[PDB]
Paper text:
Substituting His/Phe with Ser/Ile should expand the substrate-binding pocket to accommodate the bulkier substrate PET, and the strategy termed “double mutation (DM)” has proven to be useful to enhance PET hydrolytic activity of several IsPETase-like enzymes. Here, we report our experience in establishing the P. pastoris strain that expresses a PET hydrolytic enzyme from Caldimonas taiwanensis termed CtPL-DM that was identified from sequence mining from GenBank and modified by the DM strategy. Structural analysis indicates that a putative N-glycosylation site N181 could restrain the conformational change of a substrate-binding Trp and hamper the enzyme action.
We thus proceeded to solve the crystal structure of P. pastoris-expressed CtPL-DM to explore the possible reason underlying the loss of activity. The catalytic triad was found in an open cleft formed on the protein surface. The TPA-binding W180 adopts the C-type conformation in the CtPL-DM structure and an alternative type in CtPL-DM-S155A. Notably, N181 is located adjacent to the TPA-binding residue W180, and its glycosylation, if any, could likely impose spatial hindrance to prevent W180 from wobbling and impact the substrate binding. Nonetheless, W180 in F235L-S155A, which carries N181A mutation, shall be able to wobble freely.
Numbering used by the authors: 23 to 292
């Protein structure tokens, strides 16, 4: 009933469909300054406090630039977000899983460095992952291999075998793009959703009439996907149950019965 991780005002649909109440800054993380991952783009609230840490991976030949929406939209709702670049454009999901792990390790280190823009902004104990395509698989692999992680949002996950995810205990929200021809939802995203233990808080939202890149910068679903992603991270990274209506109740139903959505699965309520 006391939630120490609680931040921002009581959520409204309209507030969650746009940049949040937290002023943010971004800096880049040079490839040369890190091993474990290929650098990337760091977004953080300027307000004093410690926030959940979120690492986001692009997919095959993907760059951090294509997911800056996720950096800005999540950070502005009260998170520290690192959208990574990979060691190589050709890294497979198991590799993207290690890099997400290492990027989260990096944020924890920088959190103790008085020179860092994120000095004392990172709650080391509250970590989440997300990613596009092979980055989505990577995010679910990292969540499997780091069960202390609070949340995973695989977005249009590629074809890591759904078998690999039968022991995921980390609350997982999967985005699908209905007319994805690169990672068809019916053979890729949906079997992964179904492979996750039913005791694991989970959710699948499928964007109607859109392709593999419907979740990326300019995909055309900033309002709805952002609102779902913010709500998933708030719910599980911040244990903020004010966000339940947006993933399980009235405001989720609004979204998931809307023309924008072609499929919806979940083990609600939570
Ligand atoms: C998991 O839940 C699904 C969806 O309701 C159900 O089909 C399946 O039997 C459940 N799995 C187990 C192991 O009970
Ligand atoms: Ca689109």
């Amino acid at each position: 009933e006391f939630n120490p991780y609680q931040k921002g005002p009581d959520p409204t649909a309209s507030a969650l469909e746009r940049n949040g109440p937290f002023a943010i800054r971004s800096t880049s993380v040079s490839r040369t300054s890190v091993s474990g991952f290929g650098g990337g783009r760091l977004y953080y609230p300027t307000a004093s406090g410690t926030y959940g840490a979120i690492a986001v991976s692009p997919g095959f030949t993907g760059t951090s630039s294509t997911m800056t929406f996720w950096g800005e939209r999540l950070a502005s709702h009260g998170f520290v977000v690192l959208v990574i670049d990979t060691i190589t454009l050709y890294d497979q999901p198991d590799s993207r899983a290690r890099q997400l792990k290492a990027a989260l390790d990096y944020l924890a280190t920088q959190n103790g460095r008085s020179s860092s823009p994120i000095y004392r902004k990172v709650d080391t104990s509250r970590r989440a992952v997300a990613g596009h395509s092979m980055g989505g698989g990577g995010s679910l692999l990292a969540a499997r291999d780091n069960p202390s992680y609070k949340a995973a949002i695989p977005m249009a996950p590629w074809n890591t075998s759904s078998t690999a995810f039968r022991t995921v205990s980390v609350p997982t929200m999967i985005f699908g793009c209905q007319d994805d021809s690169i990672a068809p939802v019916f053979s890729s995203a949906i079997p992964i959703y179904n492979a996750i233990p039913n005791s694991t808080r989970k959710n699948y939202v499928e964007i109607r009439n859109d392709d593999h890149f419907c979740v990326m910068n300019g995909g055309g679903h900033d309002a709805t996907l952002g609102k779902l992603g913010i709500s998933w991270m708030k719910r599980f990274v911040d244990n903020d149950t004010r966000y339940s209506p947006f993933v399980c109740g009235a405001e989720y139903n609004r979204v998931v019965s809307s023309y924008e959505v072609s499929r919806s699965y979940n083990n609600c309520p939570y």
